[PDB]
């Protein structure tokens, strides 16, 4: 599939990842997802096997003929080349402009600079992708004074008026910093930027930008028509560098989001970290994403024309796919390759891709989805994705991987079932190996701290259980429920201890026997009088409650310990409020 896709893209053919009604021809193999198998039959789409693919290459003439789809694709491709040539001499004329100006100044350093710096977007029209996010940021910034006049009470149609500060988050290399700086520069604001190079703890944040919330640029007066030239746009790049739960400045930046008299902008990479939790509902969240290949294709054509080296236009898609939408790293790749290899073409693309592949660590959900696939445990699949690859895949998120495997290993339809083995048998084997991995995990995280035993836990808790039940997920990748239930159980244990030691005097029973035996009896001494006679037994319930040194808080705590048919949440709800109101007042 990978090699055929390389040959499919070898002749300028778009290779979509999903089957559609407008799809022209589908190359059929042996086995794939059932959704594709049912989609091809009903829509009567043209199907050509691999034997017809070989004669397709020789039979199809160049340019794709005069077909309606082929003609439309060519003129769009020519337009992409046309706009590439139009902007190629735009900087060349600019380069001649600055060189003449520089020569005059000398009488009366370039071409030795990183390509990601010289080819940086001069204005907002030179960016590639995320047009909507850029315009959203610009509309928020240009209307910040209007929201300041309205005291941030009512926003507009977009809803950015209420948010005093905007936030930028997205993957590396896509242009958050450049977009923010260009939007700040275009409107005429004065950019006040901080970063991880200098300390940004609580103390110097209080002694630094804190006094800049309602003060203007000293250079702003001396730089002057401009109406926004004497203000601050706080640009904190790399918010993730505040690696401090308490001594860090994340809560301090939250306090700035609370109170600030000037536009403020944040740039980070990943938002969903527990460290950066206090930023959940604070700022106009502007999300950037991996841009589509067309804009980068045009920009790379401009760069290649300007740099006197040629790469095939179809190669750009493979370069973007290899680098995972990192434009700056694409320019770095071009600069590194162009030193000796001046021809980036069909022959060098495979070596370039396998040499510059980006090994990005996967998220827990992607790890679970990748691990419960029946293809990688097949004979052909496992050769490409070896066992060490699966071990590394676990080790990307080893703290969460076994939990994510255990959460949804029985929610998937298996495709690696042994002959004569039912799904339940595979689930039983996976559960047994999960228990063994749990034992190994307890041994690892103990007094001995046998951290050299981690790969065995990796296998036993993620690789072996998944290799028995791998295939297609019936539902969706679900987050582990053990964390929330564990927190709930710890809280319930804390309450159980509190009430147990409140009734410790006179009770010869430990905390375990309190819940199993004592607590069901307390319900029929502290709730049934409320049910069978109402408020007429207010004193009797208080008499029992006071006898065991039980407070009003303990009364509500006991009711939540019950399960099944003895759940008292509905029983208390059905009790009238007048009856319950008197019980609280009499105790107080």
């Amino acid at each position: 599939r990978g090699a055929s896709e390389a040959l499919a893209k070898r002749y300028g053919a778009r290779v979509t990842k999903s089957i559609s009604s407008k799809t022209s021809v589908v190359v059929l193999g042996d086995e794939a997802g059932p959704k594709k198998l049912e989609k091809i039959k009903q829509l009567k789409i043209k199907a050509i096997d691999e034997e017809g693919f070989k004669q397709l290459i020789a039979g199809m003439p160049a340019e794709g003929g005069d077909g309606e789809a082929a003609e439309k694709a060519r003129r769009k491709l020519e337009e992409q080349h046309n706009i590439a040539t139009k902007e190629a001499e735009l900087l060349v004329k600019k380069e001649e402009e600055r060189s003449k100006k520089l020569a005059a100044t000398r009488v009366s350093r370039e071409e030795d600079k990183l390509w990601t710096v010289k080819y940086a977007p001069t204005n907002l029209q030179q960016v590639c992708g995320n047009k909507g996010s850029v315009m959203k940021l610009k509309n928020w910034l240009a209307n910040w004074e209007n929201s300041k006049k309205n005291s941030f009470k009512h926003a507009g149609k977009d809803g950015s008026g209420v948010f005093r500060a905007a936030m930028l988050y997205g993957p590396p290399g896509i242009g958050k910093t450049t977009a923010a700086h260009l939007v700040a520069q275009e409107l005429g604001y004065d950019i006040l930027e901080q970063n991880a190079s200098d300390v940004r703890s609580k103390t110097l944040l209080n002694a630094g930008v804190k006094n800049a919330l309602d003060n203007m640029s000293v250079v702003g007066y001396f730089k002057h028509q401009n109406l926004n030239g004497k203000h601050f746009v706080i640009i904190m790049d790399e918010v993730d560098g505040m690696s401090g739960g308490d001594r860090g400045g994340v809560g301090q930046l939250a306090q700035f989001c609370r109170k600030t008299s000037t536009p403020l902008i944040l740039i980070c990479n990943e938002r969903n970290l527990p460290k950066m939790r206090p930023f959940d509902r604070v700022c106009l969240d502007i999300q950037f994403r991996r841009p589509d290949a067309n804009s980068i294709k045009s920009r790379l054509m401009t760069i290649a024309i300007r740099e006197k080296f040629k790469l095939d236009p179809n190669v750009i898609d493979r370069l973007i796919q290899t680098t995972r939408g990192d434009i700056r790293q694409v320019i770095n790749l071009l600069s590194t390759i162009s030193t000796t290899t001046k021809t980036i073409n069909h022959e060098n693309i495979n070596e370039i891709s396998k040499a510059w592949e980006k090994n990005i660590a996967l998220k827990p959900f992607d790890i679970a989805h990748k691990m419960l696939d029946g293809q990688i445990y097949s004979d052909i699949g496992s050769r490409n994705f070896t066992l060490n690859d699966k071990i590394a895949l676990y080790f990307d998120d080893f703290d969460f991987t076994p939990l994510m495997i255990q959460e949804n290993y029985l929610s998937t339809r298996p495709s690696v079932l042994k002959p004569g083995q039912s799904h339940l048998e595979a689930v039983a084997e996976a559960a047994n190996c999960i228990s063994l991995g749990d034992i190994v995990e307890k041994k690892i995280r103990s007094s001995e701290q046998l951290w050299s035993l981690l790969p065995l836990h990796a296998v036993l808790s993620s690789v072996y259980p998944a290799s028995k039940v791998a295939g297609h997920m019936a539902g969706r990748i679900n987050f582990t429920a053990w964390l929330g239930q564990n927190s709930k159980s710890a809280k319930y244990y804390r309450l159980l201890q509190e009430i147990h030691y409140h009734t410790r005097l006179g009770t010869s029973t430990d905390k375990i026997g309190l819940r199993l035996d004592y607590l069901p009896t307390f319900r029929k001494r502290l709730l049934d009088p409320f049910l069978k006679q109402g408020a007429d037994a207010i004193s009797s319930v208080i008499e029992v409650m006071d006898d065991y040194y039980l407070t009003k808080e303990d009364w509500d705590s006991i009711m939540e310990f019950f399960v099944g048919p003895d759940v008292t949440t509905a029983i208390i709800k059905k009790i009238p409020a007048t009856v319950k109101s008197g019980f609280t007042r009499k105790y107080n």
């Binding site: 255990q406 029985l410 929610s411 039912s422 799904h423 339940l424 048998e425 689930v427 039983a428 559960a431 047994n432 999960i434 228990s435 063994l436 749990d438 034992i439 995990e441 307890k442 007094s447 429920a481 053990w482 239930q485 709930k488 159980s489 319930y492 244990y493 159980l496 201890q497 030691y501 410790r504 005097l505 006179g506 009770t507 010869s508 029973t509 430990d510 905390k511 375990i512 026997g513 819940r515 199993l516 035996d517 004592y518 069901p520 009896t521 307390f522 029929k524 001494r525 049934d528 008499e543 029992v544 006898d547 065991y548 310990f561 019950f562 399960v563 099944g564 048919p565 003895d566």
Partner: protein, 341 residues
């Protein structure tokens, strides 16, 4: 007090009508209290072990053992993970429980016992839930009780003493507390119902209460009180025997396992188990009750029952050797469903 289980608890050795031979043994031990060694009472749950311990303390020290208060001691582990534990102290003795963090139960055994071992001539320390120690508090306690013995003594109360390590069982005088028969439970319940006011027709209902508790004084007493309260203090011949909500949930889970043996049944069982563990119910008791509820189903033959008990033993070992309790229970249920289907 308000509950009948704590209202008629005996306060002396002569006030016990529960085990004659055990009470005679305790009287023999209290006859010469000076050379009393470190004790270890073990037996089935709910039989009255701590009642025996308090009665023995009263026989050795005197009235005032039951005039006890609660004080809180501050303990600091590694780093600044502050832990609050309250000791239920008293004149003439001390009471401590592993109710602290299971991985932090060593620090209380070290510091508190070294503090109270500073200086008739000794103080008694009672350790409830002694089977819940994690092999390190016991390791410290070995030398803690071997070195300091002329000023401190231990009464180590536990059930199913297998987790207790060999040296601790070596330096502890083991005392066995058997559960009573049906007649003794019925006699105690009859004493309760004649000390209080309950209308009863035929004492067969008391025999049924004794049968349901399965040799448990606490469960039988609480069941009697609950049934009297539900029946408006007038017990009937066909009064419905109550069961804890946990028992009903476990029985429903067993019926679900027996009836349907699919994987959606397995995820439903996972949800039920998650609720049960989240509601303060130990995993080993859960596995034991699930096993003995599965073995009570009459539709199974001997092969399925043997496989169920074998897997139950294996996963009981796993539960004792592991910390993620839901993992082993889910594995056990999956194995049982694979065996039955």
């Amino acid at each position: 007090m308000s509950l009948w289980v704590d209202k008629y608890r005996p306060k002396s050795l002569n006030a016990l009508s529960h085990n004659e031979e055990l009470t005679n043994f305790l009287k023999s031990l209290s006859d010469q209290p000076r050379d009393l060694p470190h004790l270890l009472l073990y037996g089935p749950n709910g039989t009255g072990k701590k009642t025996r311990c308090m009665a023995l303390l009263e026989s050795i020290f005197g009235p005032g053992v039951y005039r006890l208060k609660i004080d809180v001691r501050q303990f600091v582990t590694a780093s600044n993970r502050k832990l609050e534990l309250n000791v239920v102290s008293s004149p003439y003795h001390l009471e401590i429980t592993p109710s602290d963090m299971g991985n932090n139960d060593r620090i209380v055994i070290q510091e508190l016992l070294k503090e109270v071992a500073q200086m008739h001539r000794y103080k008694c320390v009672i350790i409830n839930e002694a089977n819940s120690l994690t092999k390190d508090a016991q390791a410290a306690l070995r030398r803690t009780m071997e070195k300091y013995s002329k000023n401190i003594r231990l009464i180590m109360v536990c059930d199913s003493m297998s987790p207790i390590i060999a040296p601790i069982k070596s330096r502890c005088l083991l005392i066995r507390c058997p559960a009573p028969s049906d007649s003794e439970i019925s006699t105690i319940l009859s004493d309760v119902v004649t000390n209080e006011r309950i209308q009863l027709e035929t004492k067969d209902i008391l025999k049924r209460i004794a049968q349901a508790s399965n040799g448990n004084l606490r469960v039988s007493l609480l069941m009697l009180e609950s049934m009297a309260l539900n029946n408006e203090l007038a017990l009937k011949s066909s009064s419905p025997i109550i069961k804890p909500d946990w028992i009903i949930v476990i029985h429903k889970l067993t019926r679900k396992i027996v009836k349907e043996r699919s994987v959606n049944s397995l995820i439903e069982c996972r949800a039920v188990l998650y609720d049960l563990l989240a509601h303060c119910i130990p995993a080993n008791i859960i596995l034991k009750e699930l096993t003995f509820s599965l073995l009570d189903v009459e539709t199974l033959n001997t092969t399925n029952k043997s496989s169920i008990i074998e897997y139950s033993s294996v996963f009981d070992e796993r539960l004792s050797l592991g910390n993620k309790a839901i993992f082993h229970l889910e594995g056990f249920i999956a194995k049982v469903m694979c065996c039955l289907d």
